[model samples]
Target: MELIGDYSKAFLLQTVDGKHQDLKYISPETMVALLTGKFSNIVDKFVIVDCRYPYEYEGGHIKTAVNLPLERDAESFLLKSPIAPKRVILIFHCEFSSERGPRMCRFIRERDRAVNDYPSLYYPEMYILKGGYKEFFPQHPNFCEPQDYRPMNHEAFKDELKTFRLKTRSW
Candidate 1:
């Protein structure tokens, strides 16, 4: 089994989002490296999590990403999180990775802390994908499911995004 991520080599973002200063951020380029198997020798596997809504996700998303659109879905994911012998990291993202991405990462981390013994964690190497799908889809459409893109604020999805945002009051 391999070890958790090496923070030193990670493309950790230097900017702060005020609320998520404690969470780690990795560049879209770094995400590509992981998806392309560049870190296969250092890590056993990774999972990309799209924290966006169903409509946003359905339009297009990273080929390897799993959609955990709600806390209920996230809880289900936690059920199988631990017990893995291999080193695994989670990359989370939304449209901007500014709100929902960090929120879910922290949510999982808190749950991880609550479920485990003192100082132990099932997945301590969680990261928020910097710039989110909005930034990544353009850079590497080939890695996307349909080689297509959609922005949360795209005029076409504005009304749809509005409903979701209204539901969570997450704007």
Candidate 2:
């Protein structure tokens, strides 16, 4: 959990234990296609969930994203809202999908089934933005508010990053 990781090239993903499968993923290009409008499935029908720390998000982030930093932020958006079934999407990302992004994705999914009917999901159309914001910004700066980027291990957060990465947690 403390160590960072990668999922930039991954799609149709699964959890390591193999319990979850077909966990949807989208690349930076695909993100643009969805948010630039005209795709009715996602047009005005989805939100980017920024899992980056508030410090990073304050520095730069997607215009379309809502900052919900930790796994329990799932409580803020997921449990509080009525499930849309297939109608809306929650596209999640951290600095990288390496760790926090995927963790939040799965946390909500676990919350999804726990609160919904058996085997059904509260968020049936959730997505992980592959490679997350770090990779995404270089390719789509206009998609961001400040059009800036920062890596988690940057000098600004080198100390905090090490402490944060060490925590082992749930899906």
Candidate 3:
């Protein structure tokens, strides 16, 4: 059997409505798929945001994952970024379950209708890297899952994240 390591609880202490909360992390496959963009389910499109420091981002990160330090203004960033609320499947974690990643996940999930567009709405389909970046990234050098992490430009973002939209009249 392919030993997929141990199934540990990758907890995140995300904040919501200015309050702190908990977020349970998911499997490696799930994390892998999300980061690589192999799984883009419109409502659950993968978006791996490295909650590490700006220095870490400059050094090297999980490809397309932008550096949004949880210690910084995460809520405002998410609210206004191209990633529509509840649509973007965010997978955040620190270097090794450090602190900010889980905390942020828990925070956003608690927002009113924050996770409404997310598949079931029970909770936004988010997770913390079981072992965090230090443990996982080594396994997969190319952060992107099936599709390499590609930065979203205006034209691409619309086409890439247009799953929730219906047929448009525009040619």
Candidate 4:
């Protein structure tokens, strides 16, 4: 599925009807389910392509995802890999907030389209961690250093403020 453009509410909606690029665009919930639930055994059945630079990957990654560094020669990385397009799923990811994830997805899809034949594997699945590794790692604090920050649940606070907004005045 074409997971292109800035990820926003509007862009996400555009993906719902298959508007952008006419490719499959899995919703965030569906994507999470596929990776964390359905295809949890990734190393065996999927090709997790880490699109971040080598240094970023060195810090951490989804276990066993190949570090292709999309900034480098993407073609070589994909072609050389034993992960066959028709045989395995491909999940493209990178550090959150970087373009590498989406960029790699586009590049891979484009290359496959040009050849007029997808590899024997199902067309590669595309995904960008909604928030990338930074988001995932923090959830499992023991896996890395734990920070001492805690955040108030702002939604409740906002609801509480709505009532006070009409009563409050500058002192």
**Best candidate (score: TM-score):** 1
Worst 10 residues of 2 by lDDT: 1-10
Candidate number achieving the greatest lDDT relative to the actual structure: 1
> Model 3, residue 156: what's the lDDT?
42
Which residue pairs collide, candidate 2?
A: 2-165, 2-166
- Write candidate 2's Cα lDDT for 4-104 as tens digits: 11212222222222122445667787778777764664233777889877667877898869888766665666678754532556788888647677778
Q: Return whichever of 2 and 3 wins on lDDT.
A: 2
RMSD to true structure for each model, in Å: 4.6, 7.8, 14.1, 14.3
Give one digit per residue, the lDDT tens place, for model 1 in 1-171.
223333324332233243477777777788888888777877776778899987889999999799886766776776455536446688889987467888888887777777777566776678888889988888898999977776677788778976776665244
Error of 3 at 85 (Å): 8.4
Q: How much is 117 displaced in model 1, in angstroms?
A: 0.2
**Candidate 4 similarity to native, TM-score:** 0.53
Tens-digit lDDT string for candidate 4 (124-165): 444455555556566643432233211222343555435433
What is the Å distance of residue 162 in model 3 from its true position?
41
lDDT of model 2 at residue 140?
Answer: 85
Runs of candidate 3 exceeding 4 Å displacement: 1-22, 35-37, 41-44, 70-72, 85-87, 112-123, 144-171
